[PDB]
Each structure stands twice: as structure tokens, then as C-alpha cells.
């Protein structure tokens, strides 16, 4: 007679508009779980929960797993809305939830004892792109933003304005657009009229790809520099290709070419299991899942509250290098990157699409986050 299985739950947007993200995030968790055929002597099972990229669906599926199967350990979500909602449910039963989403609140006003987050949020993304770019481009004084009229976009814009004030450059204007907007010609001509030195795209996902592609086809790169603050890294770069990307400045959470102990391992793993290089969604869920399983293994405990406490202040090898979970706000302290798209001729392989120009840690003091644990 075998031991009772223990189940780890991946919350992934397997269907709907974010199916591609979910596919690779799921691949990431699966790689982590496969490294533990058993965990503390018990067979380790993985169960995917489809959030459908919808907060309501995420909550109901998590609630069912908690009630019916005694679920406690979760990793994933694509959307901040889903993660905020899920965080409350996991928090109520004293489980553990690690997420890659980017809303600042996850580790701020809405933090809880059960919830941890790997990605750098808007505060750091803005600072690790714009600040090093200002250093690279001392004569770039006039900065124009294009922003989705939505909470994540406004947070980025809020940050871009703080940086402009702090560093003596000029925010010369802004164009808002809806999350559904497919047409950017009008906002691009607004930018042209403003005569910027840098066009800053504060949109994200499919929309930023469409915006950037229109900007480039419009002739923008011949007139001014372009920065996409919040890019999806490799998988987005592959879709756009070097003709679009060449010379464009890009912010990202992860880059497969960075030489670190865990990244070397991860690249070998994805090459041997899927025949590809790791992308951001894959890497974020790989590490988020590995931290949880490693800490269960280290503590000898399946108790959520015990594992969560052990994760506070934990230092470990991660995809960006040596990373630590800050105890006070449950934020992973790690690099965010500024890259620039490469010219086709400088590429060594199909994935050699961008060059890292800067990497660094920008995080607020815990006392400024609103997180009170
Ligand atoms: Cl989601």
C-alpha cells in the first residue's frame, strides 16, 4: 500500500485570451514538480487549475480544490485581478500562494501572510529602465508616454512622472488609450507633434506588440528612441522579430542568456524537455514552484504557515542570480533588465534577439509599501 499523494496546484490561464502565457507557465511548474518524484516520502502530484484568465473562475476553482481535495499550495495566475482574489482564499485557509503577476498591491496594501510574488512590480520596472536609459542618452530631455487608461497603466505612468521629476527630464505629454484599442496612428501622430526624444510605451501584452509594430511601420525609430517598459521578454521578441525590434529599448523580468547557476540548469532542462530556450512565463513559474517545493523539502512540513514563515527572508539561486524573498513585504528581490533589440546581423541564433544593457534592483522600503504583516 502506497503513501498518500501530496498535490501541488498550478493556477494557469490554459484557455481564453491568455492561453499562450498559460501554456508556458504550466510548462514551468511541470519542470519543477518533475524534479521531485516524491516529496517527504509521498508521491508528488501536479494538478492544473484553469483560471481562464478570469478572477471569478480562478476563485471558484481554487475554492473547490480547497474544499474537496484539501488543497493548500498554489502557484500561478496570469492577471493581477485573479491573484488578488486568489490570495484572499488561500490566506483564509493558511496555505501558500506564489505568483508572477505585477501589480504593486500584491506586496503592498493587499499583502498577506500566505502570498509571495516573484516579478518586479511597476515601481522597479520604471526605475530599472528609465534611469539607466537616461544615463545612456544624456541628450534625451523630452519624453512622451502612451498609456492604457487602466490601473496598471496608470501605475506605470505615475512612476514615469516620478522619475522625470527626480532626474531633471521633461514629461512633455501623454496619450491615453483603452485596453481594447487596436489602432495607434492617432496617438503616434500626437507623439510626433510633441517632438519627443523618447517615446515611452506603457502598454503591455498583445497590445504593446501591436503598438510597437505600428510605431515602427510608421517611421518612429527614425525620429526618436522607443522604450517599451514592460515587455514579455523572449516570447514577445520572437513574435516581433529583429526588423521591428532593432534599436528599441525593452524592459524585462528574465533573459535566458544571463549566466547564473540556476539559469544554466533551467536552460539545460528546457532544451532537454522541450527543445527550446526558457521564456519569462516559463521561468517565473518554474522558480516560483521550485521555491515552494524546496522549502517543503527543507522544513519537512506540509503546513502552509510553517512553509510561509520559512520563505520569509529566504535566499536561494534563481533565474536572475542570487535572489532573496524580503521578509517584510513578501517581494522577491531580484534584477529587472533594460535590453535593446539587436540588428539581425549581430544575432548568433534565432533567440539572440536583444542585448542586456543594464540590470538592477529597485524596490521601495517596506515602510513605504503599505504592507503590514
Ligand atoms: Cl489568471
Amino acid at each position: 500500500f502506497a503513501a498518500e499523494p501530496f498535490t501541488f496546484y498550478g493556477l494557469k490561464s490554459m484557455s481564453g485570451a491568455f492561453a499562450s502565457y498559460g501554456k508556458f507557465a504550466d510548462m514551468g511548474s511541470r519542470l519543477a514538480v518533475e524534479q521531485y518524484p516524491t516529496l517527504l516520502g509521498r508521491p508528488l502530484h501536479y494538478k492544473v487549475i484553469d483560471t481562464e484568465g478570469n478572477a471569478g473562475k480562478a476563485v471558484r476553482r481554487v475554492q473547490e480544490a480547497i474544499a474537496q481535495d484539501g488543497a493548500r499550495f498554489f502557484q500561478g495566475c496570469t492577471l493581477s485581478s485573479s491573484a488578488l482574489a486568489v490570495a484572499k482564499e488561500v490566506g483564509k485557509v493558511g496555505g501558500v500562494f506564489m505568483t508572477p503577476v505585477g501589480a504593486d498591491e500584491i506586496t503592498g496594501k493587499d499583502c498577506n501572510a500566505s502570498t509571495f510574488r516573484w516579478s518586479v512590480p511597476t515601481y522597479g520596472a520604471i526605475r530599472e529602465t528609465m534611469v539607466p536609459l537616461i544615463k545612456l542618452l544624456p541628450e534625451a530631455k523630452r519624453w512622451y508616454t502612451i498609456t492604457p487608461q487602466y490601473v496598471f497603466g496608470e501605475a506605470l505612468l505615475e512612476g514615469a512622472k516620478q522619475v522625470c521629476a527626480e532626474h531633471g527630464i521633461e514629461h512633455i505629454g501623454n496619450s491615453y488609450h483603452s485596453l481594447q484599442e487596436q489602432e495607434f496612428s492617432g496617438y503616434l501622430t500626437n507623439a510626433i507633434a510633441a517632438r519627443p526624444d523618447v517615446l515611452v510605451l506603457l502598454n503591455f501584452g498583445s497590445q504593446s506588440s501591436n503598438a510597437l509594430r505600428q510605431a515602427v511601420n510608421f517611421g518612429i525609430k527614425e525620429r526618436m528612441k522607443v522604450l517599451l517598459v514592460w515587455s514579455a521578454g523572449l516570447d514577445q521578441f520572437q513574435e516581433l522579430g529583429s526588423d521591428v525590434l532593432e534599436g528599441v529599448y525593452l524592459g524585462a523580468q528574465y533573459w535566458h542568456q544571463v549566466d547564473t547557476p540556476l539559469n544554466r540548469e533551467l536552460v539545460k532542462l528546457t532544451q532537454a524537455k522541450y527543445g527550446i530556450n526558457p521564456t519569462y512565463p516559463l521561468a517565473a513559474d518554474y522558480i516560483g514552484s521550485k521555491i515552494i517545493l524546496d522549502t517543503i523539502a527543507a522544513t519537512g512540513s506540509f503546513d502552509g504557515a510553517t512553509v510561509a514563515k520559512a520563505m520569509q527572508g529566504l535566499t536561494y539561486q534563481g533565474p536572475t542570480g542570487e535572489e532573496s524573498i524580503r521578509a517584510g513585504d513578501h517581494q522577491v528581490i531580484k534584477d529587472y533588465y533594460l535590453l535593446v533589440g539587436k540588428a539581425a546581423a549581430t544575432m548568433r541564433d534565432k533567440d539572440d534577439l536583444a542585448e542586456v544593457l543594464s540590470a538592477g534592483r529597485s524596490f521601495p522600503d517596506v515602510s513605504a509599501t503599505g504592507c503590514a504583516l
Side-chain angles (χ1 to χ4, degrees):
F1 273 74
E4 177 180 34
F6 170 79
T7 308
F8 181 78
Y9 297 78
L11 307 178
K12 315 291 174 201
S13 58
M14 302 303 290
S15 63
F18 297 97
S20 292
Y21 190 104
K23 179 192 192 177
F24 288 82
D26 177 52
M27 284 158 63
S29 292
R30 287 184 184 276
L31 291 178
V33 171
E34 288 185 308
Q35 297 183 292
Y36 285 88
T38 59
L39 178 57
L40 306 178
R42 291 167 64 183
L44 175 59
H45 292 190
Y46 175 61
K47 171 70 177 42
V48 181
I49 283 171
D50 181 8
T51 67
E52 311 188 28
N54 179 281
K57 300 278 188 188
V59 174
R60 278 164 238 131
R61 304 287 90 75
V62 163
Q63 284 171 337
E64 291 160 4
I66 290 171
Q68 297 180 35
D69 305 307
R72 291 295 189 269
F73 295 86
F74 299 89
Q75 196 284 320
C77 294
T78 299
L79 304 186
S80 295
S81 60
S82 304
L84 285 162
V86 167
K88 305 193 200 188
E89 301 301 318
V90 178
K92 188 188 167 192
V93 304
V96 170
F97 172 42
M98 160 81 71
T99 188
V101 304
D104 295 71
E105 308 86 76
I106 296 288
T107 55
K109 62 167 186 186
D110 296 308
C111 76
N112 69 36
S114 291
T115 297
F116 296 83
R117 187 260 299 283
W118 183 78
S119 296
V120 179
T122 70
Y123 176 102
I126 274 290
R127 282 159 182 81
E128 292 294 329
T129 50
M130 291 184 63
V131 178
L133 190 54
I134 287 163
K135 178 176 158 187
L136 278 162
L137 303 179
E139 321 306 333
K141 308 302 299 191
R142 307 170 54 82
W143 297 57
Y144 191 101
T145 54
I146 291 175
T147 317
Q149 205 155 24
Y150 168 71
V151 285
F152 195 74
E154 304 274 17
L156 289 161
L157 183 61
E158 145 211 285
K161 290 175 184 183
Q162 289 158 12
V163 166
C164 286
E166 291 179 21
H167 290 82
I169 57 171
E170 194 172 9
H171 184 220
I172 54 161
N174 180 72
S175 290
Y176 278 119
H177 63 80
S178 70
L179 283 171
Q180 296 75 32
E181 186 61 64
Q182 298 295 304
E183 290 167 0
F184 292 89
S185 278
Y187 309 117
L188 293 176
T189 55
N190 289 348
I192 300 306
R195 291 193 297 274
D197 301 307
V198 185
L199 175 62
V200 182
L201 301 180
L202 297 177
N203 39 42
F204 41 86
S206 312
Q207 192 167 48
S208 67
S209 289
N210 192 26
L212 184 54
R213 195 190 303 280
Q214 294 182 33
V216 169
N217 284 356
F218 208 91
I220 294 293
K221 294 198 299 188
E222 299 168 333
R223 305 166 171 272
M224 67 195 73
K225 298 296 188 155
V226 181
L227 165 68
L228 171 59
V229 169
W230 190 272
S231 91
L234 180 55
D235 64 86
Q236 177 173 30
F237 301 168
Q238 291 169 330
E239 298 180 53
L240 295 168
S242 57
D243 277 305
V244 172
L245 278 191
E246 183 184 341
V248 175
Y249 299 97
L250 307 151
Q253 298 282 355
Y254 169 75
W255 186 237
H256 67 284
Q257 301 182 340
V258 181
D259 186 15
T260 73
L262 183 85
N263 200 36
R264 276 172 240 127
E265 280 174 51
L266 179 63
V267 173
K268 301 269 202 40
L269 213 46
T270 69
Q271 290 282 349
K273 289 284 174 177
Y274 301 113
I276 64 176
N277 286 313
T279 55
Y280 157 62
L282 189 153
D285 280 22
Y286 174 76
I287 187 62
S289 298
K290 178 162 156 30
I291 290 160
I292 288 177
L293 299 173
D294 284 348
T295 305
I296 287 171
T299 56
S301 175
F302 289 112
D303 176 62
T306 303
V307 172
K309 180 167 179 157
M311 285 165 68
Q312 296 185 335
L314 176 74
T315 295
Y316 61 91
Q317 295 289 339
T320 67
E322 196 165 51
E323 297 173 358
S324 287
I325 296 174
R326 190 160 63 174
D329 65 342
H330 288 190
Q331 171 66 50
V332 170
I333 304 301
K334 70 170 193 72
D335 286 344
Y336 193 81
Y337 300 93
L338 173 68
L339 303 101
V340 64
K342 291 165 60 66
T346 66
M347 295 174 57
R348 178 187 178 200
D349 60 55
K350 297 174 189 65
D351 291 331
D352 196 20
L353 285 157
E355 181 177 352
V356 174
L357 299 179
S358 183
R361 284 101 184 273
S362 292
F363 297 94
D365 295 335
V366 173
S367 59
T369 63
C371 178
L373 297 164

